[PDB]
């Protein structure tokens, strides 16, 4: 039989938008948390050619064996599909990325120029491109696509990342793509005696209406595991924590409590790893958890030393221009008393400029941010043209 584990990688699916990369996440899975997340197990027959090979069921009768499928691992899909700031902590959890363009249209369409730079920003790079729909255009008009995809990559760091070419409406070389998957998005290595750090991005109070009050359930909190482990029973707590204002004050007091039950998708788990959306029952106060109140948190065993901080300096790097519709637009260097958007793990906070130099700059945040590690990625948005764009991005010095 194949073992029933959490998934160990998270893969993020993007896409101009479309009728394609929901459709394609459903063709490969056959699928609380919620956010356009599907899990699926991968496996391979041992005595069979790739790509038909790969399965996702412990199953090899569709290549004339009994026998039962060697298991790979399990992953997980975040589907992309508005505002800047989901992306962005979408953007967060990926360990891999999957790039949709539609064959049918010119490559590359504006919205696929913008997520590609956007996923060079956040640092994702183990990716694929996909060629969905080839299915409605010629082998040769498909060639011709893939080599404008090419020439558009030559040079950048995506240079070498695979292009693959499917149907998901009509389930085409389906099992290239999850090859490509194996081959292109390996799990990354985790050091499990890391401090255990997990990003919040969803916060419920699972308690229906007309429960006994006896019966109550305390909040739960959804998110990814980013490093460590976590386990049941563990004291844990949640940073910044809870916003308190004193007359004319405001300060952050970091929320203690326990984690009663870990949970990926309808399995119950003793303990959580990273990889996968983990909704995680505690002890507290359904109030303090209800409708997302703890969106843009971490949270770490409760004896970490964690700084919470309001000012920071970030080691950073700008582009040189913005995608935009319908102009590419320039990129002016910072300046002092700007304000910006900054990206951090699961959180994205408004901060004012105080530094400017070269390579860092300094900001004064309107809340303040939990750094768990030195040198975490940060994402830099300004208000260019009324919206939020990702002009660049930065590692957090401590």
Same mark, same amino acid.
């Given at each position: 039989?194949? %073992?029933?584990?959490?998934?160990?990688?998270?893969?993020?699916?993007?896409?101009?938008?479309?009728?394609?990369?929901?459709?394609?996440?459903?063709?490969?899975?056959?699928?609380?948390?919620?956010?356009?997340?599907?899990?699926?197990?991968?496996?391979?027959?041992?005595?069979?050619?790739?790509?038909?090979?790969?399965?996702?069921?412990?199953?090899?009768?569709?290549?004339?064996?009994?026998?039962?499928?060697?298991?790979?691992?399990?992953?997980?899909?975040?589907?992309?599909?508005?505002?800047?700031?989901?992306?962005?902590?979408?953007?967060?959890?990926?360990?891999?990325?999957?790039?949709?363009?539609?064959?049918?249209?010119? &490559?590359?369409?504006?919205?696929? +120029?913008?997520?590609?730079?956007?996923?060079?920003?956040?640092?994702? #790079?183990?990716?694929?491109?996909?060629?969905?729909?080839?299915?409605?255009?010629?082998?040769?008009?498909?060639?011709?696509?893939?080599?404008?995809?090419?020439?558009?990559?030559?040079?950048?760091?995506?240079?070498?990342?695979?292009?693959?070419?499917?149907?998901?409406?009509?389930?085409?070389?389906?099992?290239?793509?999850?090859?490509?998957?194996?081959?292109?998005?390996?799990?990354?290595?985790?050091?499990?005696?890391?401090? %255990?750090?997990?990003?919040?991005?969803?916060? &419920?109070?699972?308690?229906?209406?007309?429960?006994?009050?006896?019966?109550?359930?305390?909040?739960?909190?959804?998110?990814?595991?980013? !490093?460590?482990?976590?386990?049941?029973? !563990?004291?844990?707590?949640?940073?910044?924590?809870?916003?308190?204002?004193?007359?004319?004050?405001?300060?952050?007091?970091?929320? &203690?409590?326990?984690?009663?039950?870990?949970?990926?998708?309808?399995?119950? &788990?003793?303990?959580?790893?990273?990889?996968?959306?983990?909704?995680?029952?505690?002890?507290?106060?359904?109030?303090?958890?209800?409708?997302?109140?703890?969106?843009?948190?971490?949270?770490?065993?409760?004896?970490?030393?964690?700084?919470?901080?309001?000012?920071?300096?970030?080691?950073?790097?700008?582009?040189? +221009?913005?995608?935009?519709? #319908?102009?590419?637009?320039?990129?002016? %260097?910072?300046?002092? #008393?700007?304000?910006?958007?900054?990206?951090?793990?699961?959180?994205?906070?408004?901060?004012?400029?105080?530094?400017?130099?070269?390579?860092?700059?300094?900001?004064?945040? +309107?809340?303040?941010?939990?750094?768990?590690?030195?040198?975490?990625?940060?994402?830099?948005?300004? !208000?260019?043209?009324?919206?939020? +764009?990702?002009?660049?991005?930065?590692?957090?010095?401590?």
């Amino acid at each position: 039989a194949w %073992p029933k584990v959490q998934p160990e990688v998270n893969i993020g699916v993007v896409g101009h938008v479309d009728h394609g990369k929901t459709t394609l996440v459903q063709a490969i899975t056959g699928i609380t948390i919620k956010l356009g997340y599907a899990e699926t197990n991968i496996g391979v027959c041992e005595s069979c050619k790739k790509p038909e090979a790969y399965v996702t069921e412990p199953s090899c009768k569709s290549c004339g064996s009994d026998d039962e499928p060697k298991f790979l691992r399990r992953i997980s899909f975040i589907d992309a599909p508005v505002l800047m700031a989901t992306m962005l902590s979408g953007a967060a959890l990926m360990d891999g990325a999957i790039l949709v363009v539609a064959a049918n249209e010119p &490559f590359p369409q504006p919205q696929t +120029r913008e997520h590609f730079v956007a996923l060079g920003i956040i640092g994702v #790079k183990n990716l694929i491109i996909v060629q969905n729909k080839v299915d409605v255009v010629s082998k040769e008009e498909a060639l011709s696509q893939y080599r404008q995809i090419k020439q558009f990559t030559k040079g950048t760091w995506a240079e070498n990342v695979p292009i693959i070419p499917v149907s998901a409406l009509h389930k085409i070389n389906i099992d290239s793509l999850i090859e490509g998957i194996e081959e292109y998005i390996k799990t990354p290595y985790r050091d499990l005696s890391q401090k %255990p750090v997990m990003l919040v991005i969803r916060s &419920f109070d699972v308690n229906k209406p007309g429960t006994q009050f006896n019966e109550l359930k305390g909040g739960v909190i959804g998110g990814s595991i980013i !490093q460590g482990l976590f386990k049941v029973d !563990q004291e844990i707590k949640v940073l910044p924590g809870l916003r308190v204002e004193k007359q004319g004050k405001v300060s952050y007091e970091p929320i &203690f409590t326990k984690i009663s039950s870990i949970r990926f998708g309808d399995e119950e &788990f003793k303990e959580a790893k990273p990889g996968g959306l983990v909704a995680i029952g505690t002890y507290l106060d359904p109030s303090l958890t209800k409708a997302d109140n703890l969106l843009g948190s971490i949270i770490t065993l409760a004896d970490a030393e964690v700084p919470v901080l309001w000012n920071i300096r970030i080691k950073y790097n700008l582009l040189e +221009r913005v995608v935009g519709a #319908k102009e590419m637009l320039k990129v002016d %260097p910072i300046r002092a #008393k700007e304000t910006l958007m900054l990206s951090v793990g699961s959180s994205t906070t408004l901060g004012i400029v105080t530094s400017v130099k070269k390579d860092e700059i300094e900001v004064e945040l +309107r809340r303040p941010v939990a750094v768990w590690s030195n040198n975490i990625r940060t994402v830099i948005s300004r !208000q260019i043209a009324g919206r939020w +764009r990702m002009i660049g991005w930065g590692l957090v010095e401590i």
